[PDB]
Subunit: 309 residues, 6 copies
């Protein structure tokens, strides 16, 4: 299968030590951004992927292209805006909450945020089995939001990560926009969590929220963080629990869940097995800085699973 | 409220890896000393603080001054001494006991040890609401010990952290010297732990030690380790339990606890909350190399508590 | 002497290796920004200084206050904007030009640039012997350019570093605005260079630009970069040559010069001995990453001269 | 008491970060190899040790010699082969299986594989109390295997560590060759585990495998990795359990246990106390990169033990 | 234009610090190998390239593929061998000769050494403006040498860098094979240096060596280390000097000259602009660890040139 | 031959970056100390050596022993002291003077300073062809001074590096003591420099000072830093110039020359050659942090000499 994703790629500056940023002296660079992550997770399971995105005529942008290309992502459909810098973020790890991570953005008016419909090729999208985006991409700009609308009307199959970031728009904003998005545009996949449901429908509880989402999506994945995840499908529910593992950095783990789950689905795996394998991509992510350098491979996941009894 | 502490500021050279020091290659520098940790912990709750301390006319002395200034500490009452070096110590982490840390001192005849009564100024000393010192200060030199006597016979309110180090003096001597101190000055706060209590009283039971201690101290803090703390005020007893958190280096945590506790008391939190809040501080502290770089603001503490329900 | 400078404190992520950032993995954090570097250069020669600046209500904002309070700079008239972030930048080093350094700005619409006339309280300002700002301050925004206009009109005595950054505005914008500033407001001190001089006047000979500028300034410093500096006062001319010294990061170094020089003037120093010294401060800057960590004490500059014979 | 071992020493290149080697940019160097490791654990309990091994005439070889010689190991019977390089390997830690490390060998044709009977002097071996080797030595090459044969026909007492490595030879081969070696050559000591027991004996039960092994060996030690170990000797059996501790790098833990155990037996420890003690050498190992730098002294082990009641 | 090179890609382990490897604890990983370097430097000038090589089916192998695909190199024609590992080497720097670097190999029977005629295919090679290889490829093994021969007899025009490595073969072994290969096959380009010329022809002086070599090739590039390079397009003779510049790691330097030079030729550049441009690429290289991270694009060479006035 | 040195080993903590120690974050552990340096330089040429020194019963002392054992130094005649800690010092680099390095001591009352006569043994000391030491050993205490004097009465051939250190004793003190030491004990070798001659003789001219020194030493070595050194023997003066070379850390370089020059003498080398080689030892040293790790071998020195044409 072919997955196409659209959204803003980001250069990440990962705090080399935990604690408040004002006391961190070193930052380690990684290529990230949810949709970029989804891509790599997807390819790593044996499939094919592209990204529609804009980066700057800057080292950071050219860094994003080389990195993705190496990973094997089709990038020929990306754009280089010369009037805008690539958007970047900084991760503060384990402070003020242990085990947790916080992102500090420099992306307003980024080249990523200038992703517009004119960048979305009609013939190209029409070739993907799956067109995927997220609440981040809705949030960043109205050009980008329209971009997601264009690629969704063209689509045939759609997947969405609600992926609400309150630093990017009010609970309020996020609610109507996601709700709006789901009026038109029925979804093949819908990836979310307890929190986004608390926003979108004010409904903290998993199976409830899932029943409220399921007129708009065939499959729902509840990310549950440390405790794992739940897949809802065919009027059935399967919970797949967590593993206990050193936590270096939580950022990227949601994507590792999603990208991997989508890809193994398209490799034929029964839903229980797909979520299960993806839970291991998630567990592996948690234990390094970098959203993408720990993403495993169907062989790697299997290894992980065999030696865990 | 204004706090005034007297003691030795030290420069810390923290093993960049666990293991016996003869195979550690890299050392990371931090500013510390229990009283200085107290200071910053304290100001991180919006009260004021100063320190009476001597450092050398050397780069490390100035490190100490720059760091603490940065932090908003009152350093204008510090002494610079051309005749002696600033005190330093190395930290051997997690070897030969996992979780534990060990100090290796190079402080004999330091600038800090030549802290004397002529340094403690009566007009500065009255004008604190709290004057605080520790057993390390009673131990490092007879002039420093005389300094604590002077500062206490002016103070009106006092706080002493027993803080016994068998590397600086015998269990025996320390009992004798702490009992003598407690004899001649009544305390508003006593901060200690199960270990110092066995050394002073023959009692390791917090409740039983708290009874023996309470003739000399109005509020008592029984640091219980990873198990947490218990405060004893006006007949009541309140145990507040610890947290499981990765441990990088405990050096510092005790002080983070004491200093936050004292500050939140002046801010107006009832004892139970003050202890709760102090535990998070000591809890966070443990997770990094360095005694002060991790100390939480009152807001930062609340973020911790909310995200733990 | 008191100096008050009016500017944007930036946060610096210095590339740990030379080369295009896209292949540089580690960035090292520093507090910087022209006016910031002038303050601490000024203080190190035993004079006093303060800064009018706006920061974000974020980890970097506090980074800059902590650092500068740390260095003895008055930070009690810095403002905090809860609505915009602290301005940052990256340095690319020796690529594609040996010895040279590039700044990559994430500072459009930062807190730092919301610096406004309303942040310049006159009671504080007329307390200064000398009010300094730069072209950086003019270029960043209108509101910040106006803050210079205000401050400069309360100011009895005035200092200006042209410090034209072509990434921030166009050569013609520079030329109009620096001229327009120099129309109102006469200057005790003008700091600039050959290249800024071509952009401004059309004159790149040190003397001819000097003579043309000597209408608007009592004392003029021409930064020559590697070859040193020249000073022009009272129809005299003095050239002090630079030092051959290994280059790590050239950024910070003109600031090292002007700040040192300004301070030495106020100490009683010959104009020529004040330049000689400021030169050494300049050359020391170039050997490390970070604009400020290498700024010399007067006694320190004296050791350098003594040792060079 | 003199221990002589016979094996290949390897230079270790340990990943500085978990994760697949293809996204790891730094490797930390250490001296290791099973018998080298045994050597140090043996000496750290206050007995003497020598090693018969062959290194390249290169930087890595001299690295082996220098390190061991600093440790106190007799290196006067090592060999420097100029036509083959010192063998090395890479450790990938925690990927794709958490808490586990994987060795990636670059050792075929190495100086270390060119160990031969000509390299083992009869007068040397004769004055050892214990001659020890492993199935690694046995598996690297014919010449190295043959050396173990020459040594063991000289040795009055023998020790052996099954240490099966599947990347070095097939399970069937390992089974044949270790069986061949245990019939002829009665062992004072067999160090092994549950995994090797399965390969050699069909049996994975510790009790039934020990039973199967007692025809060959007087004392038997069953490593249980994290669960502790069992020692079997004259009808007795004794299980000593393990410790919950952070895991940096599990490689080398096994040698730490066998070597500490052998050494304390000659210090006249009772078998139960010897294992108890050795489990702590094992557990300390796990906590760092490096097979040898953590190796506890008898004193250090007692500290660990006393500070755990 | 389309370039196809063939030979061994390597993973390079750069000593993080100068000095003998025995005393260096950290190693930086880079992707290297001559023909791989040429590849990137080439595509950098806006041309197309491919590489025929065989890597291990291991982490180090995919590290290679991922890197080179990222750089834009066509990798679809690379082969993966599971019976052998990817070749690697370590770089010792500035010891015992300053400014020089020393490569220590572990490549024997590597998967790259198992390049064979069967891997190079007619169609791919017949569709290429230049086929390039090197003496390292002739020297790693016969199947590899055989590979060059197959590829040369298909190639329109051929390019070859003598690149004599003495750790790989003897002097007389080099002389015979380069001459043997040059006796069949007219090269379009012959890149070599003074040293290699004394081995192949007898002749230390470049002017005599190029005359000697005009009996085999159209254009001859004489690398002259830091003195620069000479290019002999016959009749004429273009020397371009080097640039004094801090030297981190000289390895990769000559490759950078080679690859940049051949590319700019294919873009219309008069011989002397090409060597000048190629010199800056070679001189930018010398100044980082890594053979390919500093390879400049054409604009980047131009910037270097505008700014050196 | 055999060299016995008599002095203080010290652990050295080398600033990982240049600049004032108060802004440096990391230190790199190194084993150092003048006499210990001489030993390793000496052994590098193929001679024996031992050190008579005293260290603490600590990690750091044990660090000193292990390291020197590895290097091949006879340490059987060292002592360990329960009452005192191993001396240590810090290096500050290139600040405030480029190229130069400053040492910051923590050595008063160190185990090392408690070196005394009874530690120097007669049979041991007369099994050497040369007995060596320095001003550092004379300054550190009465007892170590005393011990030099006893080594020297025992010895027939003796060596003295004047090695004046002004943070250790006043100038008038060094003159007095060095001169009263030369007042008995004619010496085989006097190793000094130009500075040490202003202090001791009042004489900065190498020729004039060697003539003043000639009635006290058969052979005189005058170190010229980067200029080189002069050896004075049998009425002949040979000047040997130095090399341009990146400077990282000068400390260690004097000893590299001394130790290397001594060793080669005993190795038979013609004097000029012996001093030629010493220069390269002393010139390699300077380009790394760490007094010992760069110490060249004879073969290594000749590689330097060959590959400088």
């Amino acid at each position: 299968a072919k997955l196409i994703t659209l959204g803003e790629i980001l250069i990440e500056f990962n705090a080399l030590s935990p604690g408040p940023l004002r006391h961190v002296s070193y930052f380690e660079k990684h290529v990230a951004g949810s949709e970029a992550n989804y891509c790599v997770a997807f390819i790593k399971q044996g499939n094919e992927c592209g990204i529609i995105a804009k980066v700057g005529d800057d080292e950071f942008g050219y860094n994003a292209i080389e990195w993705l290309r190496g990973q094997g992502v089709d990038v020929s459909h990306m754009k280089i805006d010369p009037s805008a810098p690539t958007g970047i973020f900084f991760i503060q790890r384990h402070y003020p909450v242990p085990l947790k991570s916080e992102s500090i953005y420099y992306r307003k008016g980024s080249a990523g945020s200038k992703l517009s419909p004119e960048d979305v090729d009609e013939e190209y999208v029409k070739s993907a089995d799956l067109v995927h985006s997220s609440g981040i991409t809705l949030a960043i700009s109205s050009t980008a939001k329209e971009a997601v609308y264009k690629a969704f009307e063209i689509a045939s199959n759609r997947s969405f990560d609600t992926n609400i970031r309150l630093k990017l728009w009010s609970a309020e904003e996020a609610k109507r926009e996601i709700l709006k998005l789901l009026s038109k545009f029925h979804l093949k996949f819908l990836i979310t969590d307890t929190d986004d449901s608390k926003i979108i429908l004010g409904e903290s509880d998993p199976d409830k929220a899932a029943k409220a989402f399921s007129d708009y999506a065939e499959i729902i994945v509840m990310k549950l963080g440390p405790k794992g995840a739940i897949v809802y499908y065919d009027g059935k529910k399967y919970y797949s629990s967590g593993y206990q593992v050193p936590v270096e950095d939580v950022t990227g783990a949601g994507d590792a869940l999603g990208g991997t789950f989508l890809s193994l689905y398209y490799k034929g795996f029964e839903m229980e097995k797909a979520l299960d394998y993806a839970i291991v991509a998630s567990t592996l992510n948690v234990m390094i800085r970098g959203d993408q350098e720990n993403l495993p491979t169907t062989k790697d996941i299997e290894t992980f699973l065999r030696e865990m009894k």
